Design an enzyme around this catalytic site. Structure first.
Site, PDB file in Angstrom:
ATOM      1  N   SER A  47      11.439  -9.042  29.625  1.00  0.00           N
ATOM      2  CA  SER A  47      10.631  -8.262  28.629  1.00  0.00           C
ATOM      3  C   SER A  47       9.079  -8.765  28.774  1.00  0.00           C
ATOM      4  O   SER A  47       8.536  -7.767  28.395  1.00  0.00           O
ATOM      5  CB  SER A  47      11.065  -8.123  27.451  1.00  0.00           C
ATOM      6  N   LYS A  50       6.852  -5.632  30.161  1.00  0.00           N
ATOM      7  CA  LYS A  50       6.396  -4.554  29.393  1.00  0.00           C
ATOM      8  C   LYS A  50       4.738  -4.593  29.179  1.00  0.00           C
ATOM      9  O   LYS A  50       4.282  -3.550  29.187  1.00  0.00           O
ATOM     10  CB  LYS A  50       7.060  -4.902  27.782  1.00  0.00           C
ATOM     11  N   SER A  95      10.820  -4.804  21.631  1.00  0.00           N
ATOM     12  CA  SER A  95      11.368  -5.293  22.883  1.00  0.00           C
ATOM     13  C   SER A  95      12.349  -4.164  23.461  1.00  0.00           C
ATOM     14  O   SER A  95      13.495  -4.339  23.883  1.00  0.00           O
ATOM     15  CB  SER A  95      11.828  -6.757  23.175  1.00  0.00           C
ATOM     16  N   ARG A 227      10.819 -20.580  21.686  1.00  0.00           N
ATOM     17  CA  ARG A 227       9.749 -20.115  22.745  1.00  0.00           C
ATOM     18  C   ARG A 227       8.560 -20.405  22.020  1.00  0.00           C
ATOM     19  O   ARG A 227       7.684 -21.102  22.557  1.00  0.00           O
ATOM     20  CB  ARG A 227      10.123 -18.722  23.078  1.00  0.00           C
TER      21      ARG A 227
END
Ligand code: CL
Lengths: 243, 246
Positions: A47, A50, A95, A227
């Protein structure tokens, strides 16, 4: 110039994790990483794609503005946030893969390939389904290549309109306060081994901008919050953001 | 343009030993809300909230090239330490750097400043006084409901300047953002002419709505300056617009 800071490994080890953090000091034009080899290892962008997909959809007029509503198709999916109507801001925030899959089909293979070639994005290979190549196709990008691409977007230097680059930087808005601003995008590659987590973007300060790109091994979805957590531990160590 | 009065918001002013007005506008419903309809329509000096139309004019005229252009410190030491350094549009806005904006106004000039404020329908559209201080001690006046009217045009890119100019200023207005909401706003502090007041004007972006706000309160001493944001946040929390801690 690239420098290695192995002390950042303490942040991976303490969070029972394995991965790489890459930082770029804009003022000094100096890069830093805990692992030079992994910093240059290419993976599916998932993603994080994007970001260039939004830029192409906007310049082609596939997306009119950040307010245009892309209505839910009626198909119930696993992520409850996807089962509703969205605009560019919320599709990016949540997302929403089905919204971006539709953009890719409207862009088409020929324009996606040639326009992505203009950005010199990763390996520049869009092999596979036009609406899933960034999840299970042939596209590959490293954390140092994410920084290279993000720096061009920051300076409006990509070969797209200034307007599109401003809308996408607005859609990337993650966090802001009186100390700093974060513009970023998460990714989660599950289709092809190794399953990884991404967090790419930058931190805007009063007198400097710190670009970042991280990826880590992600065997289960319960580690997805690491993350941001691992990246914030590195930024706090370097006094980029407060405690 | 239907307006409803909510006097329960007065608890927030009284508890803080304060007096003022909060004006809210629900974009989806096209409905306004205030604790005081009379004060909502009372016009005051905009003070540093004028940095919003001044930035728009400066960018549109090319006085400011982009949000990165450096406006170097003139060397004169001033009371606010943050003003005694070089700035760009983002930090001049963040730190309300009056000398940077005074320079913009002198470069814009009286004739263009007046024409632009007229095309914006900004408050009383009167720029009487010094070209570089009229928003602090001149003839310009704007109400909290007129701040909302102007801010709604800026949100929709409906002002008569370039879309680019409007996008750069909405970026410069960025105050706070998280996974729940985004605040784009500007503070003001009028001290030259009585009554001394504090301003906080802007909006809250949610996933499926936008809430415009404009507040002003009596400010006899500078120790109450933090109440501009605190009293507005108390009203937003009461109306469930923003979370308590989530
Ligand atoms: Cl923004």
């Amino acid at each position: 110039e690239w420098q290695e800071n192995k002390s950042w490994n303490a942040h991976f080890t303490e969070h029972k994790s394995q991965g790489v953090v890459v930082l770029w000091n804009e003022n000094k034009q100096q890069g830093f990483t805990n692992n030079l080899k992994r910093a240059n290892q290419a993976f599916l962008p998932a993603s994080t794609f994007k970001i260039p997909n939004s830029l192409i959809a906007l310049d082609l007029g596939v997306v009119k503005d950040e307010h245009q509503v892309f209505k839910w198709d009626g198909q119930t999916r696993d992520i409850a946030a996807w089962n509703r109507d969205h605009d560019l801001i919320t599709a990016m925030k949540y997302s929403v893969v089905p919204v971006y899959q539709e953009f890719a089909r409207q862009i088409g293979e020929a324009r996606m390939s040639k326009m992505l070639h203009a950005f010199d994005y990763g390996n520049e290979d869009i092999s596979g389904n036009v609406d899933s190549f960034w999840l299970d196709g042939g596209i590959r990008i490293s954390a140092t290549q994410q920084i290279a691409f993000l720096r061009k977007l920051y300076h409006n230097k990509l070969h797209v309109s200034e307007r599109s680059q401003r809308i996408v930087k607005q859609a990337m808005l993650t966090e802001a306060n009186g100390d700093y601003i974060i513009r970023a995008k998460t990714g989660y590659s599950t289709s092809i081994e190794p399953k990884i987590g991404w967090w790419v973007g930058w931190v805007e300060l009063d007198d400097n901008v710190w670009f970042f790109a991280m990826n880590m091994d992600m065997p289960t979805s319960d580690g997805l919050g690491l993350r941001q957590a691992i990246t914030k531990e590195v930024l706090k160590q370097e006094k980029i953001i407060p405690l």
